[model samples]
Target: AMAPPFFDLKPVSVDLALGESGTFKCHVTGTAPIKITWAKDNREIRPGGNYKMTLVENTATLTVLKVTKGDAGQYTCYASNVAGKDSCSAQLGVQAPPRFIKKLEPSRIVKQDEHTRYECKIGGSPEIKVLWYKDETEIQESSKFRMSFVESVAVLEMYNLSVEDSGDYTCEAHNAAGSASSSTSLKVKEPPVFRKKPHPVETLKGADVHLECELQGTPPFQVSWHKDKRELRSGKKYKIMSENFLTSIHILNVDSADIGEYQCKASNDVGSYTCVGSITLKA
Candidate 1:
C-alpha cells in the first residue's frame, strides 16, 4: 500500500512588475514515486518560452520570466501518487511601475523676476512618490520653489526666477516597482541694467577725474565709456577698467574739455542699457 501525497510547504503570493521574473516553490512529502506538476488558473504549465518547471526531491518549482498581466493569477502546485493526490494554490499580483506618459520639455527659457513652471504626466498602477532635483540636488519646498501633483500630472513652479535658478532639472517618480525620471535644462536671462550709476562730481581743473558705475546682468558684459559723445579708449590719456559687475574710467588731467556729459554703456546677449553723469569744474 502507498501513502498519499501531502504538502509540507506551500507557495506564497507575490507582487511584481512587468519585465521581471518570479519563482514559486512548494515542498511536499508523501510515498515514493510521487510526481509534481504546476498549473496557472487550472491550466497546466509547460517548460517552454517564459515558463520553466523543475522538481528536486520533494520540492516543486515554477519560474516565469518577462512577466506580464497574463501571468498574474492563481498558481497551483499539485502532487500525485498511486494512493492519493494533493494540491496547494497561491495568487500572483502584478503592478505597473511608474512611467512618464508626458515627458518634460528638453529646454526652457525664462527671464529674471518672472514666474515659470514645468509639468509632466505619469501613470502607474499604485500611487507614486514625486520629487524634484536641480543639478542632482534635491529641491525642498520653499517660497522660491513650489511643487504640486494632481491627477496624473506633476508640476514644479519657480517664482522670481534668478540667474542662480539656471541649471539642469529633473522630475522623478518612484513606486515600489520601479522609478522613472524626466530632465530639462533651464536658462534664465536678463537684459543689462545699471544697478548703480556714476555720480556727478566737481573736480579741480588740473586734478584727475574718476568715474565708475555698477552693472547687473548676465556676463560677459560689453562696457564702454563716452565723454561728450566721444568714445574713450584705454591709453595714457584715459584709463578704462572693468571687473565683475563694475566698470570704471579714469580721466587724466581733468581740463575744461573733461567738464561734460559722461556716459557708461553696458550690453550683453540680452540687451543694452546706458547711464549718464556730468562733471563740473570747481573754483
Candidate 2:
C-alpha cells in the first residue's frame, strides 16, 4: 500500500519600501497536490477580483500592489486537503516614510528697483515639484520671480525685485511618497550711500596702514575690501574691521608687498559702490 502524502510547508519572505509593491509565493511538495489559502494577520484573504490566488502545478502565489504603511504585518499561507494540513508564516517589513530634510527661509521686506533671492533645500526622491507663494498668492512662471531647481535644492531669484516682493514666501516640495514645505519673510530697504575716506599717501616699511570705506543705508549694506580686483582674505597681517556704514582694512608689518591699489566695495539690494586708494612704501 502507498503511504499517505505528507504536507511540506516552506516559509516565504519579501522586503519592500513604502509606497511600493511586493509578492509572496507558497511552495507545497507532496505526492498529491494540495489546496492553498492566503491570510493576513490571521484574517482569511478572500480570493475574488483584486485578491487573486493562483494554483499551478504544486505552487501558489499572492501578489500585493501599492503596499502602504498599513500593509506591514505577518502573513500566513495554509495548504490543506484530504491529504494533510500544513502552514507557513512570513513577516512583511516595509520601509519608513520619506522625509524632506531641507530648511529655507523667506525675505523680510524688499524695496523698489532691487533684486532678491530666496532659497531652500530638500532631500528625497528626484524630480520633486517645488511651488512658491507670496502672502498666500501663488507665484507662477510668468511672475517677476524666477524659479529654478539644482539637484535637490530649489532657488527663487528675482530680478529688479520690488516692494511687491516684500512678503512671506512659502516653498513646498512634493513627490510620490509625500509632501513638505517651509516659509520665510523678506524685507527690502532704500538704496545705500557710500562715504569715502582720504586715500593714504605714504607709509614706512613695517608700519601698519589703514584704509576706510563707509556706507549708510536703511537696511544696511555688505562691505568687502579688495586689493586691486582680487577679494581680500582676513589674516594676521591683513584685517578687515567692519561695523555699520564703516569698514576698515588694516595692513600690519607693511612692506613693498602692501604697496598697491586697494579698493573697498559696498553693496546693498539696490546698488553697489567701489572706492580705490593707493599706498606707496617709503624706503
Candidate 3:
C-alpha cells in the first residue's frame, strides 16, 4: 500500500497470431490494497471460455485464448478503492493469417471453345498475395491465361478452351503471417460415348444380380439404372457404382418383387446414351 495507487506494469500493445494465447497484467499498490479488474472497450471482463481473470496479492491478470478479430481493441486495467478509481489501457493487435472464405463456390464448367472464369475469395491482413496453378503446374499469365485480384477476391480467366484444357485449377493466397489454398475442377463439356456397352443381366429368384458396364469419353460421366422404364437410384436394394465411364449395378436378394426390364443410362453435361439391350431374369 502507498499514498497513491499506480500501475506497476501497464497493458502494452501486443501482436498475437490467430488462435494463440496471451496474457495482460495490471499490477498496483496503494495505502489500502485497492480492488482491480479488467475490461475491453470499457466492458467488464469475466472468466469465460475465451477470457480468464486471475489475481495474486495486489496484481490482476487477464488471459485470452484463441485470438479473434473482436479481441483486437483497447483493454483497460481498472484499479479502485475508498480513495478513488483509475484505469489504464493498452492496444491488442490480433494478426489473422491467410484463410479461404467458406462461401466460395465449386469448380467451373465450360463448353469447348467457350470462355470461362474462376474466382477465389480469401481473408487476412495486409492483403494476401494470390497465385494460380493448373494441372499441378504454376500458370503464368500470358495470352491464354489471365489473372487479377481485388482486395481479397482473386480471379482467373481462360478463353477459347478445348478438350486439352479440362482438369483441376488451384488458387493459393499467402501473406507474411501465413498462407492458405483452395482448388476447383475445370471441365470442357463433351457427349457421352461408350467404349463398352452394358450387356443383359440374368439371375435366379432369391439370388443377387450384378450388371457391369464400361465406356470412355471426355470423362466425369454419370451412369444410371432403370427398372421397366422406371428410373432407379442407389439404396438398400439398388447399388449403383461408377468410375469414369465404367459402372456396376448390383441388386441385393433379387426376387419376383425385384424382377423387371433393367436399363443402364450414361450421361454427361452435353449428351446422354441409354442401353436397354437386355436384362433377362427368371424365378
Candidate 4:
C-alpha cells in the first residue's frame, strides 16, 4: 500500500545575473520525512556561509548566495527513503560579462575569387551572441559571407570574394552583461591577368616597333620581357617600359637579328601571368 520515495516536483533550471541569488527546489512524495541532499556538478554540496540548504515538509531547496560565474553548473537534488531513492537535476546559469580569449588579429589578406575565413574566440558564463560587421556596418549571412561558431570561437567565412569585400571587419561578442568587439582589416589582393596579350608584329628594318599588353591586377606588379627564352636587359635600341597598366618593349633600328619570340610576363606575390608575342623584321 506504499510506494518508494519519488520526485513529485523535479528541479528546474535557474538563470541568475551577477551578484543575484538563485534557488533550486525539489519536492518528493510517497514516503514520510524523506532525506534530501544536493550536489553540484556531481560533487556533494553542504550548507555553508555562501549556501543555504533547507527542507520544508516534502520540499527541499538549495539556495546559492551571490550567484556568479563560479556558481554556474548542473545541480542535482536527491530524495531518499527506506524503500528507495530518487533524484532530479537542473542547470544553474550565472551570467558574466563576455571576455575575449583570443582577440582577432588586426589584418588579413585573401586573393580575389578565393575562399577564406576569420575567427574570434571568446568566453563568458552565459552563452554570448556573435555579430559580424564590415566597416562598422552589420554583416549578414549570404552566399558570400557565412557565420558560425565552434564552442567559443566565432567564425566568418567568405567565398568567391572580390576587392569590394576588402574592408575593416569586426566580430562582436555580446551578452546582457556587456559586449566586446575586435576588428580585422581584410585586404583582397587581385592577381595579375593579361587583359590584352601581345600580338605578332612586322616592321621595316629601320622602323620602330612596339610590342605591348594591358595588365589587370594590383600594383606594383613587376613586368619583364624575354627574347627567345632569354631575359632581356634594357638597351638603347631595345627599351622596356611600363606605364599605368600597360607594358611594352620599344625597338628602334631593327635588323634581321631582332626577329625572335618575345614574352611579356607580369608578377606579384599573388601570381604570375605571361603573354607572348613575336617580332619579325622586313628589309
- Model 4, span 1-283: residue lDDT tens: 2567888898889778778887888888976767788888988997766669888988888889877678888999887778888899999877777888998888888888999888878998657899999999999999889999778989998999888999999999888677888888988889988877566899998888988888888778888888776887688777888765888899888888778888888987688899788888666
Give lDDT per model, in order. 0.88, 0.72, 0.77, 0.84
Output the better candidate (2/4) by TM-score: 4
Model 1 lDDT per residue over 141-209, tens place: 998899998999999998999898899999999987789999999999887888765678889978998
Query: For residue 119, what is the lDDT in candidate 2?
Result: 72
When superposed on Cα atoms, how far off is each prediction in RMSD?
4.8, 14.8, 14.6, 7.1
Model 4 clash count equals: 0
* Candidate 4 RMSD to the real structure: 7.1
Which residue pairs show backbone clashes in model 4? none
**What's the residue-level lDDT of 44 in candidate 3?**
84
State the RMSD for candidate 2.
14.8
Per-residue lDDT, model 2, residue 114, is: 65
* Clash count (model 3, backbone only): 3
Give the TM-score (vs. native) of candidate 3: 0.49
Query: TM-scores of all models?
Result: 0.68, 0.41, 0.49, 0.68
lDDT of 3 by residue, 16-111 (tens): 777787988878877566888788998888776688887798778788877877898888988887777778888888877888884335667777
Weakest 10 consecutive residues of candidate 2 by summed lDDT: 1-10
